[PDB]
Symmetry: C5
Subunit: 311 residues, 5 copies
């Protein structure tokens, strides 16, 4: 079966549409997500047109084998070709209404610099390669683009599922390719992070600042170093599985700054002790007293700067 011939040197327009049934498994590290949806395709093949009176039927149903179907493919899928045809209907004029159910593991990059207060725009790209007898272009039938009300993506808030209606028509290996961009907009549910990660992490850091109200070097070393181990362990406890970025993330800056704070705390503790030993308790006292305000103020300030830089 060859493609439908043109009426007069025109390309075949294939009207597309993705309707989301289920969304699941957003893998941050892999930068992938899985989807269960309908794919609707509509085009005109005049060769299939008929008189409804003669046939005694208002619409004819076909098997995929029986008629010519455009080779529509997904660009960014990790999944194998997972598709089941639901219906093929030919209206009296020769308009074919194709419908299939599919599931795919889609590969779309994520921006982690605002993590865990980040939002994403996931993409599902559709392509079709132009054939020797006719060029093919994609179109969006907005009536056949949407998502079911049940559609959820664990740990995320689903904002929208739209399509950039104008395709990207370009040349590849001497043939025309027509590409559409379906966008799934989502925003991370950040609630969990504040009682489960930010607050316990801030408590461990604050414990280290009690060393500014002690003159016991043995107690201070234990304080600052034990909270440092506790901090590490706490992030081991998180089992952070955020991929490696060629850029700095909001979380990454904060964590780094916290290591620096743990370091400076050690220096203060060391200086205070050295001065007490060097029979200069006057300076040792001044530094310790200053650090009681310096450490919380600098931390709060640095965080304001960081928050500002990231958002």
């Amino acid at each position: 079966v060859s493609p439908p011939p043109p009426i007069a040197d025109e390309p075949l327009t294939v009207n597309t549409g993705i309707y989301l049934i289920e969304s699941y498994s957003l893998d941050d590290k892999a930068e992938t997500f899985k989807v269960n949806a309908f794919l609707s395709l509509s085009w005109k093949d005049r060769r299939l047109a008929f008189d409804p009176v003669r046939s005694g039927v208002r619409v004819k149903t076909y098997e995929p084998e029986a008629i010519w179907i455009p080779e529509i493919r997904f660009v960014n899928v990790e999944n194998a070709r997972d598709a089941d045809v639901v219906d093929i209907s030919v209206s009296p004029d020769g308009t074919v209404q194709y419908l299939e159910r599919f599931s795919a593991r889609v590969l779309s990059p994520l921006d982690f610099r605002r993590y865990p207060f980040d939002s994403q725009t996931l993409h599902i790209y559709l392509i079709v390669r132009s054939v020797d007898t006719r060029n093919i272009v994609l179109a969006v039938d907005l009536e056949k683009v949407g998502k079911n009300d049940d559609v959820f993506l664990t740990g995320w808030d689903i904002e929208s599922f739209t399509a950039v209606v104008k395709p990207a028509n370009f040349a590849l290996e001497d043939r025309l390719e027509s590409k559409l961009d379906y966008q799934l907009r989502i925003s991370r549910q950040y609630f969990s992070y504040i009682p489960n990660w930010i607050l316990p992490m801030l408590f461990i850091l604050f414990i280290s600042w009690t060393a500014f109200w002690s003159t016991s070097y043995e107690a201070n070393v234990t304080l600052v170093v034990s909270t440092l181990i506790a901090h590490i362990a706490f992030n081991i406890l998180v089992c952070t599985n955020l991929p490696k970025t060629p850029y700095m993330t909001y979380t990454g800056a904060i964590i780094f700054m916290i290591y620096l704070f743990y370091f400076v705390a050690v220096i203060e503790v060391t200086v205070q002790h050295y001065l007490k030993v060097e029979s200069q308790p006057a300076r040792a006292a001044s530094i310790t007293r200053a650090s009681r305000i310096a450490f919380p103020v600098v931390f709060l300030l640095a965080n304001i700067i960081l928050a500002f830089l990231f958002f």
Copy 2:
């Protein structure tokens, strides 16, 4: 093969029934479970009807290819079509009785706020898309809905497997959809959590409260901080298998409260030491003495409040 034509403008009623053979693999983080089951389908197609006296047979058996079968689909499955036809029987009147064995990874959301004392209602949804020639509705044959007595789901207690007999009726892309809700009611076996997690975690926290019977700052710092590290490692030991919720869980609250208790214990230990150093041992003694009753009483009280709020 087209659907059976109506006697007089009536929809095709497809009688369904899911009989659970095996249930397994409840993934909390994925919010999925796997199932091994029978799917029974029955509808009337008068074109298949026969006079048994002529046939010399009371029931005729068919191959799926040979006759029209309604395209029943599962809404919420992650799984690829995994179905094997067991039997297709046509009664003399035209009633087709279809039976298949299937297995599926079902995606059903879970409520974690009462975790690990939570109960779930898992769903298996069946759909049928109405066709161009005839509209289709799903029905439940209660005699063909059940579970085998062996059916177990590790770490859970299986309460029931029932079906909401009335289907959903709605339009999708200009066609009528008939959905059925099969509900598998389960309740978490919480026993394990009390000796393996709750009690050892309460012991580590109690050890920290011995600092209210000591005046040794070095010993107290060691106590409170080491038990805090211990706590973290103990939860790292858990290797928590719980998804990130946009809400607070019972477990989540408890853990948070325990971090707060570790923090306040440090403050007391710090204050008691500072006052002893400031030559005010009368206040330092009063605080330490109060804390001996305050810490356990507030903890017990706060837990009563939480338990009340969650259950």
Copy 3:
């Protein structure tokens, strides 16, 4: 293809046999195991009868497609239908002799209360659903039930592979099911646990008892608390691979009892210190001296009781 007709109202006996080629992947958590085996089936289909004088051949060989084969299914598998037909031989009488190679992830529950000194009985259940024209019953050909001498299951000792010869013939969804039970008896190789887990865990607990020979509160706090951390880390090191049971396990009890011992050790250390501080070193000495015999004796006794309760 319909089943063979009865001579006079008798059911079709399908003689079965599983011969294990390979066993592997016993997943404790999942309660599953994988198997590579032969499945032998035999029944009579007189429609296939032939005269070898005419046929020239003493036994005919067929393709699964060519003849009626009973729909034998595995009840408790996770796996998809993974089967390769090796031979289908028919003798002049019509007796079919079917052989296939299969692999399957079998789901059979495990009893963990005697872990890691536990023994298991794994099951492989065959079923055949009776058809409209003839009832089908399963049978065991003992000559075709066994395991190869190489057959191993890592971390377990394979005792036996036998079959309950009497099938569980019952009624389901108005038809007759004939169920056979195959039993793979195994016992856990517990050697590894004693030098790798039991002994280093007993050493860490013993180190904590050295606090009964010290009067230094700072040293005692360090001892008892650091060994508690060590213990946690050591079970984190084990990365325990056991499921959550609705019952108490031998290992589970031991671990719990060890946590309780760590707690009571802290109480003693606390009491001894408070008394010394309260200028009552006479009682503090008595307690510490008693604890030197109390803790080992109570531990040994409690373990005898537990061992007795579990075995």
Copy 4:
């Protein structure tokens, strides 16, 4: 269908080309990567040649079944044959132009001695085995070799995707084999490692060097040993998953040298204490004072030597 016969004892030249659509999942431990790409093949089959005036068509399209296609295989793939034919076009002279979409998990070794500042050359090898009737050789059509501009490999910078134009002809099991080498050149995005791993690891080591400004053995033991634990935990936190190499890696040497520094630090702390106890504080002071310059200088120097040796 047999291969096209030679005009006069010449081998069949199959013009190849791989066009990368998507690259993903570079697994360092497995030394594998996944690819989604076009495979273009072209050969002249003179039996397929046609007169365009008689046919009334300038190019004929075929089904893979209809014509002889060379058996091109990938050498180094872990993946199963995942290929979908897009187009088969025969020009009037009989020159077939084949195009397929494939995805494969490619096994190519990696050099870890410069990790995490390493660059790789990934290989995709195409083979063809000469047949009994005609010998086959591979060629590169440079116009059909490339990658889309979107092509990304998470955590890596994609430099180039080129092919060694000259194939490697050799004999195997008495037949001629034509191999082509496609090279995907990538360099690791090392940014992440400096704030997330190198710097916090250097801070933990610096904290241990404060023991050179203290005379308190109890405080020093705490410092040096706790930071040693922190270092371990920090690398557990990294969950380094870099395979086991028969050679020393840059990272591996650094880590090793850090363990040695932690050991020497303990010796210094031990020596300093022993001398103070032996009433030789003059030597103890000299050593501690020396160590303040010795440790940082030796470390900086050793790192320059290492960097030089590795780069």
Copy 5:
């Protein structure tokens, strides 16, 4: 298609040969490895014999369907039947030369007592079941057994890939089974373990021995216990990937011994302190002085004994 008939009561000899293309994924815990190879089969079928002159061809090519092919199977594969036929060629006398590309996940047990200085013999077993008309036996064509020069297995050294030429012919379920043993000899690349595991682990133990140069019980308790935690974490850091053996391994013994050393060190530290407290510093000094030589000597000696017992 029946098997070729015998000339005079002789079995059919099928000449086999495995040629390794790729080897990868040696899973120690699963005791499996993956392979990509060629399988060459050759047998004589006189029904396929021809006069070269009549057909005008020296060799005829076939489709697997067209001719009788022996059902050769792999015994110890976890993998599903992953095979692609490359070529089938019939020589004028009727000798069929079959060639296929396969990939399999092979299950072969491993000996871990000399780990990580262990060597393995991995097996690939080929079986053939004798048919009703003719008995089939396996043979090795040594010219068709080998491995490509590129063949590597990460973390191992590939010594040889040979085949025990005499098959194991035996009776199974009343038919004759002919089995061939293909052997892949490998030896572990142990370099990595000495700087990454053995040496940092020995350093942590040596740090604990500094307690024999200190009289400070608080410092010694910290030393011995902290290094014991460090040791655990260091093996948790290693996250050892070795299954559970019913026998003791070299690594296993070493680790155990190290735990015993950590325990004895605590005893010494406890004894030394008790004696100092009991105002017997003469004995306390003697023990500490002895331990300075006892611990290294006993350790070195015990290791010599162990090494000797294992190798």
